[PDB]
Amino acid sequence: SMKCKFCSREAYIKIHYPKMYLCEEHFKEYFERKVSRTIERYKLLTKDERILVAVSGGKDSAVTAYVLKKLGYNIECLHINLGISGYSEKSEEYAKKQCKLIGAPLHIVRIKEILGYGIGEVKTRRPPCSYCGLTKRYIMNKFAYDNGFDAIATGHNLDDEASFLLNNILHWNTEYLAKGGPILPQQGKFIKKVKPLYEVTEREVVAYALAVGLEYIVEECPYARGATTLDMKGVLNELEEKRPGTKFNFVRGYLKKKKLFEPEIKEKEIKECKICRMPSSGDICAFCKFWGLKKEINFKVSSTDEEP
Amino acid sequence: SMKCKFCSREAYIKIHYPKMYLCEEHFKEYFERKVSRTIERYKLLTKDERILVAVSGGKDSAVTAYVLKKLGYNIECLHINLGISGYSEKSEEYAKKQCKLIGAPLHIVRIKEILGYGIGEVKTRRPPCSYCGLTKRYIMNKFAYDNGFDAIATGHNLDDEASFLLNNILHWNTEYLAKGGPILPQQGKFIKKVKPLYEVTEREVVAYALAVGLEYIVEECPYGATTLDMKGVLNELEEKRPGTKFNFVRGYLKKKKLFEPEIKEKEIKECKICRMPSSGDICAFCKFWGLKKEINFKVSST
Numbered sequence: 001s002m003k004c005k006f007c008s009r010e011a012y013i014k015i016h017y018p019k020m021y022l023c024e025e026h027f028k029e030y031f032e033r034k035v036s037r038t039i040e041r042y043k044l045l046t047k048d049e050r051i052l053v054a055v056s057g058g059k060d061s062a063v064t065a066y067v068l069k070k071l072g073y074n075i076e077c078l079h080i081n082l083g084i085s086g087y088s089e090k091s092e093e094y095a096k097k098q099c100k101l102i103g104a105p106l107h108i109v110r111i112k113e114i115l116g117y118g119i120g121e122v123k124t125r126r127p128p129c130s131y132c133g134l135t136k137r138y139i140m141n142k143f144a145y146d147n148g149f150d151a152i153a154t155g156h157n158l159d160d161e162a163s164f165l166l167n168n169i170l171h172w173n174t175e176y177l178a179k180g181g182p183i184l185p186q187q188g189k190f191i192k193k194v195k196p197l198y199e200v201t202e203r204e205v206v207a208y209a210l211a212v213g214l215e216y217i218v219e220e221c222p223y224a225r226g227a228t229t230l231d232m233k234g235v236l237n238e239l240e241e242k243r244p245g246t247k248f249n250f251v252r253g254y255l256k257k258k259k260l261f262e263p264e265i266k267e268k269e270i271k272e273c274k275i276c277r278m279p280s281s282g283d284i285c286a287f288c289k290f291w292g293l294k295k296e297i298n299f300k301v302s303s304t305d306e307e308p
Numbered sequence: 309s310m311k312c313k314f315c316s317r318e319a320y321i322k323i324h325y326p327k328m329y330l331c332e333e334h335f336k337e338y339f340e341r342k343v344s345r346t347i348e349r350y351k352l353l354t355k356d357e358r359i360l361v362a363v364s365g366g367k368d369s370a371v372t373a374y375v376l377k378k379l380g381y382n383i384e385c386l387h388i389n390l391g392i393s394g395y396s397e398k399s400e401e402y403a404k405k406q407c408k409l410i411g412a413p414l415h416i417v418r419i420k421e422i423l424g425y426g427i428g429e430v431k432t433r434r435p436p437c438s439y440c441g442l443t444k445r446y447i448m449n450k451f452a453y454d455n456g457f458d459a460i461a462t463g464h465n466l467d468d469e470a471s472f473l474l475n476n477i478l479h480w481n482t483e484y485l486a487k488g489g490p491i492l493p494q495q496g497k498f499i500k501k502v503k504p505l506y507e508v509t510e511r512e513v514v515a516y517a518l519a520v521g522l523e524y525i526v527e528e529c530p531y532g533a534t535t536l537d538m539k540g541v542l543n544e545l546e547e548k549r550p551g552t553k554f555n556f557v558r559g560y561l562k563k564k565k566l567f568e569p570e571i572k573e574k575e576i577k578e579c580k581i582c583r584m585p586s587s588g589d590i591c592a593f594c595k596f597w598g599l600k601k602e603i604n605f606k607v608s609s610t
């Protein structure tokens with residue numbers, strides 16, 4: 001077995017791009033520095049901002065919160081319990097454990113308490129994974145807005161971006177290809193969304209979580225029909241194995257040529273929801289229409305979990 | 309084993325896009341019709357045109373020539389012997405066999421006779437496979453031009469296009485992405501280049517060549533497997549979701565226009581030596597081969 005390129009310790013991991021062997025400690029430092037560089041590169045965050053980390057219970061958002069906290073950022077965390085019996089309880093417990101170890105405040109929103117129904121419970125023909133993303137994205141935006149947070153940070157890694165690009169390139173979804181990247185800058189009541197793990201691989205995320213002692217959910221959604229992302233991920237991993245830096249250069253190259261997909265948006269119709277005043281297309285937004293809401297949900301909090 | 313969707317014969321192949329089982333005869337008919345449809349779709353060729361099929365000795369160009377001949381087109385074939393000792397002789401023999409079975413006239417150009425050196429004999433740091441596509445593309449263009457051919461047809465299949473797109477999307481080669489598709493329309497001394505096999509898979513090409521009795525070289529140059537890596541990956545994707553390769557290529561044709569502003573167009577000049585399209589005084593071909601005079605490919609086919 002090879003040793004660390006920086007110290008006299010057994011190598012914990014081998015980085016393929018650039019090729020090197022690092023120990024448990026020099027990898028942690030490498031990872032943290034690589035995330036720090038991503039935040040500097042695309043001017044993601046400042047240390048004065050109040051950051052809201054959307055924590056799922058999985059590795060990605062747990063490591064996002066951990067690294068940002070270690071780098072000395074002003075973070076708070078949000079976990080959305082989608083009320084899936086036999087999945088949401090374990091995921092909520094995992095998020096609690098993570099935020100406890102990280103030492104960051106955790107806010108929990110239970111959709112079965114707010115909207116009455118959990119995900120998969122509503123009388124719908126549409127799959128539960130479709131209105132899932134709509135429910136999470138809205139709740140994390142309105143929570144951040146209602147509580148005056150400057151930015152939202154998600155767990156999306158290099159593999160997530162590479163697979164999203166590959167999938168939309170294959171389908172020629174030029175509108176989705178124009179809206180990618182590490183920053184979704186603040187547009188009205190839409191809080192700034194950032195991806196600090198944009199240039200780190202899922203493999204590096206797994207190794208970092210194991211090293212710092214972060215326990216997480218690997219379990220995918222039980223309501224899922226098809227493994228499209230896993231198919232794209234496996235394919236890009238095969239390509240990466242032969243040519244290291246494939247994922248990186250594909251994503252970085254895309255940022256240089258994203259401008260070409262920009263004339264595809266052509267959208268200029270902006271409205272405010274009659275129920276919650278959040279950005280809408282028409283009288284009522286997709287969220288209030290789907291959940292059959294007559295009144296606005298206020299996510300503004302004073303007394304957070306274990307606080308007065 | 310399933311039977312043919314059209315007759316009482318054992319199925320030879322299972323087409324996945326669109327899903328159906330066909331026999332040796334109904335597959336031949338389907339393949340031929342699918343190629344006919346490609347020629348109609350992008351207005352590739354007319355039956356009055358004199359077509360030059362660039363035959364390598366491999367399956368693709370052999371099937372291109374065969375199908376065009378069967379569909380009733382005016383074809384002639386060109387084989388370029390790159391003088392690679394232990395490769396070029398077998399490839400020339402394979403092309404002869406193919407054109408004999410097809411029943412199409414075959415013209416042979418030996419680069420070791422014309423340029424003095426074979427590909428891999430010239431004192432160069434760069435690999436031969438780089439100045440190979442340069443030598444082939446030039447010779448097949450000047451041959452077609454010198455002999456008054458209306459179009460050049462190559463063996464490029466759906467897999468070749470899908471892998472080229474995937475490779476240039478991964479590298480974000482937006483200039484190469486603007487110049488793709490089934491037609492390279494005639495621009496001056498550059499003859500119209502077409503891809504009749506644009507919508508047929510390599511798997512369908514292998515099955516067609518075996519059915520009609522075409523023998524070929526399973527082309528692996530003696531001088532990296534980037535294309536095979538892209539092909540294997542797209543085959544994996546196709547196995548899970550059929551029609552991936554087709555929708556990727558067809559979708560690309562709808563959005564090719566987006567890569568067009570990445571033109572970066574330079575002044576169009578004529579070569580001081582051979583008058584063929586050039587960037588500067590002398591073209592890349594005459595510069596590399598150190599040519600002082602023009603090569604005339606004009607032939608009197610008795």
Ligand SMILES: Nc1ncnc2c1ncn2[C@@H]1O[C@H](COP(=O)(O)O)[C@@H](O)[C@H]1O
Nearest residue numbers: 054055056060061078079080154155156
């Ligand atoms: N239940 C959840 N509660 C809070 N944040 C979540 C939840 N599910 C996902 N997220 C966040 O959303 C990001 C993308 O999630 P996904 O669409 O499941 O890949 C994750 O990396 C997390 O930052």
Ligand SMILES: Nc1ncnc2c1ncn2[C@@H]1O[C@H](COP(=O)(O)O)[C@@H](O)[C@H]1O
Nearest residue numbers: 362363364368369386387388462463464
């Ligand atoms: N030696 C050759 N002589 C004539 N045509 C060729 C030759 N090599 C390749 N071609 C043609 O050019 C196409 C693309 O070239 P390649 O990518 O090298 O296979 C082939 O499918 C053939 O139709």
Ligand code: FES
Nearest residue numbers: 128129132221223
């Ligand atoms: S229901 Fe949320 S991802 Fe499946």
Ligand code: FES
Nearest residue numbers: 436437440529531
């Ligand atoms: S030298 Fe022509 S393909 Fe290798």
Ligand SMILES: [Zn+2]
Nearest residue numbers: 004007023026
């Ligand atoms: Zn070390």
Ligand SMILES: [Zn+2]
Nearest residue numbers: 273276285288
């Ligand atoms: Zn609303």
Ligand SMILES: [Zn+2]
Nearest residue numbers: 312315331334
């Ligand atoms: Zn049949």
Ligand SMILES: [Zn+2]
Nearest residue numbers: 579582591594
């Ligand atoms: Zn010249």
